[PDB]
Design a protein around this nucleic acid. Structure first.
Length: 44
DNA sequence: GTCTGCTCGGCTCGAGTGTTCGATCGCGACTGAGGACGAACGCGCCCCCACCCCCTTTTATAGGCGCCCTT
């Protein structure tokens, strides 16, 4: 979660693209929501 | 005198209320990351400070050069 917050939005966007997260969540690009979704996907 | 019925008391069970504990949510604080501003360093441009050429005078010396106009 510390390194996930240290992802600095842009690389988290590329990671969400890599996992196969749908483009709506990538599109809103809220940082906190993005990092919560990528933490959830790394839990999944 | 005996038997039977009725009433009262005691015990047990069930329900309700209260208290305690656990879980979830919200708020606050701390840490990390990003952005902006300031300072320092480097590079480029401009201004200055560089130059050895010119210089008028003197003197000795002398060939090439004029010119000098009178016969």
């Amino acid at each position: 979660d510390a390194d996930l917050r240290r992802l600095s939005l842009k690389n988290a966007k590329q990671l969400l693209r890599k996992f196969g997260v749908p483009e709506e969540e990538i599109k809103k690009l809220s940082r906190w929501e993005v990092i919560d979704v990528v933490r959830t996907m790394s839990t999944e």
